[PDB]
Amino acid sequence: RSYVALPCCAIQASAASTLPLFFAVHSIHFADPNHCNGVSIAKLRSKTGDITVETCVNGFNLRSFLVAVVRRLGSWASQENLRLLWYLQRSLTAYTVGFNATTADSSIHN
Amino acid sequence: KEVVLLDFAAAGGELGWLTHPYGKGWDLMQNIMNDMPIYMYSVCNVMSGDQDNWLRTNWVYRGEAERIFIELKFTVRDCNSFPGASSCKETFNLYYAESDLDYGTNFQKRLFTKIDTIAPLNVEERSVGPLTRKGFYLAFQDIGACVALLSVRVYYKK
Amino acid sequence: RSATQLINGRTNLSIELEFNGTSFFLNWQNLLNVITEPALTELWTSAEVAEDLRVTLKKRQSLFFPNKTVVISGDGHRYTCEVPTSSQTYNIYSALPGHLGGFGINARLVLGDIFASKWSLFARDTPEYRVFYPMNVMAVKFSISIGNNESGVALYGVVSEDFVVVTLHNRSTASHLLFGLPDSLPSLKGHATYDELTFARNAKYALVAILPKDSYQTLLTENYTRIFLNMTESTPLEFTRTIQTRIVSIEARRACAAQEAAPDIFLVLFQMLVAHFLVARGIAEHRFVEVDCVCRQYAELYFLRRISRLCMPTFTTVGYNHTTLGAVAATQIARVSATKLASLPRSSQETVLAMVQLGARDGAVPSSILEGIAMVVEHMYTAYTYVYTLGDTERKLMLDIHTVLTDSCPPKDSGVSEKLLRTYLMFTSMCTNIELGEMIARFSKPDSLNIYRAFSPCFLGLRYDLHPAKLRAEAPRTAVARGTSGFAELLHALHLLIPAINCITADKIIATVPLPHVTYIISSEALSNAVVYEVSEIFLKSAMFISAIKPDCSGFNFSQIDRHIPIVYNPRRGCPLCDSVIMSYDESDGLQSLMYVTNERVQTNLFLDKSPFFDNNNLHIHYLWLRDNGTVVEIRG
Ligand SMILES: *[C@@H]1O[C@H](CO)[C@@H](O[C@@H]2O[C@H](CO)[C@@H](O)[C@H](O)[C@H]2NC(C)=O)[C@H](O)[C@H]1NC(C)=O
Ligand SMILES: *[C@@H]1O[C@H](CO)[C@@H](O[C@@H]2O[C@H](CO)[C@@H](O)[C@H](O)[C@H]2NC(C)=O)[C@H](O)[C@H]1NC(C)=O
Ligand SMILES: *[C@@H]1O[C@H](CO)[C@@H](O)[C@H](O)[C@H]1NC(C)=O
Ligand SMILES: *[C@@H]1O[C@H](CO)[C@@H](O)[C@H](O)[C@H]1NC(C)=O
Ligand SMILES: [Cl-]
Ligand SMILES: [Cl-]
Ligand SMILES: [Cl-]
Ligand SMILES: [Cl-]
Ligand code: NA
Ligand code: NA
Ligand code: NA
Ligand code: NA
Ligand code: NA
Ligand code: NA
Ligand code: NA
Ligand code: NA
Ligand code: NA
Ligand code: NA
């Protein structure tokens, strides 16, 4: 679950009710502000049987979730945890400077 | 016209295909487009070098089909969209093989004839004929590409 | 189904950058150990990671983002309760280091009293869930509810060891104000980060305002730099007192239950929470704290809470307990006797009163403290009769005395309750015409009004005529409309019959005068078991009846055959006025002043030019002498 063939995706209205449980997510795949037309999206990869399930999620919301998760580690936060936290903060602000109506539109990646 | 013997996109995820490297290589994957589940067989081991990942379809009973058309709908991720191991490719290979019986999970690359190299949603179509045995398999070989194969439909005219 | 079942031997949650090639990893087992499975589930659900980006854009565009964070290079004010090496320290009960609280104690226990109960915040059904991730913290909760559930508003906040968060909800979208440590503020959600919402910042503390663009215009136009400076660069004590002044200002406008000025009440609540927070932070940032200093801080905080509940009756606070500090204060105040308290300097006896507030146990003030209060008020009143004015220090002392006397079980012994009646009567003797005019003038200018100048002996008096119409008649620009109203408001909430004399009256009482051997009721009508005097030379609708009742409900030896008040004509050569009351009344506006004559100097000072009595320039004032044996006369000439 290292490299995705469809890095850009559209957020579907049905996903909010059929989200996989957090402990079911195998991997998280983040895009670039220099990719996917600037659209801040992400891909959860979970698995049911032979089928790896890919869920298109909000980049801002998932980044803020991971920020909250890392911040609650406190003293136990390792070097790599803090590097992850700094990636999350930097990419949040980067996606924020270019947040537009064109950028909130993820349906183009259908 | 167009009698369809095989249509992967219309199977709704209830059609599983054989993968010779099981786990690595080709994987059956679900996405949701327009709030409907769209399935595909995808592979993207681009930073690893030698690959040779095979994906074999189910057994397709020939019937009256003598000259068949294979229609592939697939996406290929640009190799320059990776920070690298510059050993990735942007094509894959289409093979087929005829048999009077269903071999099941037995997979022998020796019996599969190369139809053609598939290269750039990409829509490709190849023709095979004449077929003589009771049924046939198709096969797809990945040599280090980042491909998502979304549709495979085989049919014959009139 | 279980989280361990879903993990299924997967060591890492891997986080891949599709176009950078680097990968981060979160250990599943470590995530579970440090952050419980319920917390992970609740964070994941509350995150709403499948929310459409247009919704996030609309959420972000709905906010008001400040110009630029203002950074003050200071560190705030220095901690005033630091223990000097000139005193002792104790870890933690008979060990009594004297009194007045001049020692130090380890703050580990008093900190555990502040944050003794945990609370879950930003729950699913709450509006703050829209911007904060749910979290569990040790904190103290505050909640005001103004108006009905259809039109009202709900204000609610939380003071934790690391931050303060307060919320204003227009339906009883929401506005949020936070103050605290920038690295410890609660986790925000996708559409906003903390740096862009930080209005003012210290080297230690920061102020954040998450305000909707359509929120109350005063919140948006409010200058939070000035608020932050007044919050940090002053000691928490004077800041608490400024917040008390602001609560008094809200009281003087009849705005305690008004839907309007809800953002003003919101700011006041934010500041009160910040005051509690700063006191608690001072407690935590130091290994040992000074007992009397912390007791003063706690007393000011408790007075702020109580006066806020007086204004807005729905004001609720849960968490801020002071059991151990209260026990320390209990040991300190048990030594203080009446003469000891009355001989202390004003500041030291104020400290004693604060410790009495904190160490009240089951709402029972020691009898020694009450007798000392009587002696203090006696000296204060005897001295008042020289200049007929009161400084702000004396009014602050009276405010402390009023805070101690309210919420105190009545005295069990007869003598101490009698002395309490005496100090009440002296407070009435200080609530004269001059005092009413001065208080009206002070309340007419709410800007220059502070908590000390707003306090008056009238708040501890036995006058019951202090209503808006009477006060209007007692006032000397056009601000008298406001000054008379607000004062009345603060009189209705801070005033106080349960002593003696049960021998059948109503609420038509103008005043009550409890002398040693007779009690006078100045009422609108006569009384059954009493000697009644009809007040002469007064307007029909201001008509008064002075009913004299003895405390043992027994009759007098003299028997008047007429309820007229006889007249006598034409200082002193001994003390004929001792143990009596001199009362003035206006022919149209009824009662003006009444003074208990405690000693010879009160008697002789009654005849000074600044005295409220015997002003020959007044063509419609009458003076009555109320003696201790039940006789009432009129002084003329
Ligand atoms: C908000 O209040 C602050 C209080 O300090 C004002 O800041 C000061 O303003 C004076 C002039 O009024 C300047 O001389 C100081 O240098 C300012 N100090 C700081 C730290 O900024 C601020 O001007 C007020 N804002 C508004 C809009 O009135
Ligand atoms: C109640 O006490 C007053 C004094 O407070 C008494 O007043 C005296 O009255 C007599 C005659 O009525 C006078 O000769 C005295 O000069 C008065 N004394 C003073 C100080 O003025 C009054 O008599 C007492 N009444 C009763 C019923 O005992
Ligand atoms: C938003 O930003 C993009 C740049 O990525 C720009 O092309 C687009 O026109 C902008 N849209 C609006 C509505 O400003
Ligand atoms: C999980 O991540 C840690 C570093 O966080 C790494 O040492 C370990 O090899 C990783 N294991 C797997 C199976 O990815
Ligand atoms: Cl790194
Ligand atoms: Cl299947
Ligand atoms: Cl499909
Ligand atoms: Cl591509
Ligand atoms: Na992706
Ligand atoms: Na979950
Ligand atoms: Na940036
Ligand atoms: Na398969
Ligand atoms: Na099979
Ligand atoms: Na769960
Ligand atoms: Na809250
Ligand atoms: Na003494
Ligand atoms: Na004085
Ligand atoms: Na009153």
Author numbering:
A (entry chain L): 19 to 128
B (entry chain E): 27 to 110, 112 to 147, 163 to 200
C (entry chain H): 35 to 126, 132 to 211, 217 to 520, 527 to 546, 551 to 557, 560 to 626, 630 to 696
According to the publication:
Human herpesvirus 8 (HHV-8) is an oncogenic virus that enters cells by fusion of the viral and endosomal cellular membranes in a process mediated by viral surface glycoproteins. The membrane fusion process is mediated by the envelope glycoprotein B (gB) and the noncovalent heterodimer made of glycoproteins H and L (gH/gL), which constitute the conserved core fusion machinery of all herpesviruses. One of the cellular receptors hijacked by HHV-8 to gain access to cells is the EphA2 tyrosine kinase receptor, and the mechanistic basis of EphA2-mediated viral entry remains unclear.
We report here a 2.7-Å resolution X-ray structure of the HHV-8 gH/gL ectodomain bound to the LBD of EphA2 together with results of structure-guided mutagenesis and cell-based studies. The tertiary complex forms an extended structure 15 nm long and around 4.6 nm across its widest part, in the gH region. The full list of contact residues is given in S2 Table and is represented in S6 Fig. The gL N-terminal segment is restrained by C26 and C27 that form disulfide bonds with C74 and C54, respectively. Immediately upstream this anchoring point there is an elongated, hydrophobic “tail” (residues 21 to 25) that inserts into a hydrophobic channel formed by the EphA2 strands D and E and gL strands β2 and β3 (the “roof”). Below the gL “tail,” the single gH residue that makes contacts with EphA2—E52gH—forms a salt bridge with R103EphA2, clamping the bottom of the tunnel (the “base”). The HIEphA2 loop is well ordered and forms the DIN, while the JKEphA2 loop, which carries a short J′ helix, is not resolved in our tertiary complex structure, likely due to its already reported structural plasticity and/or displacement by gL.
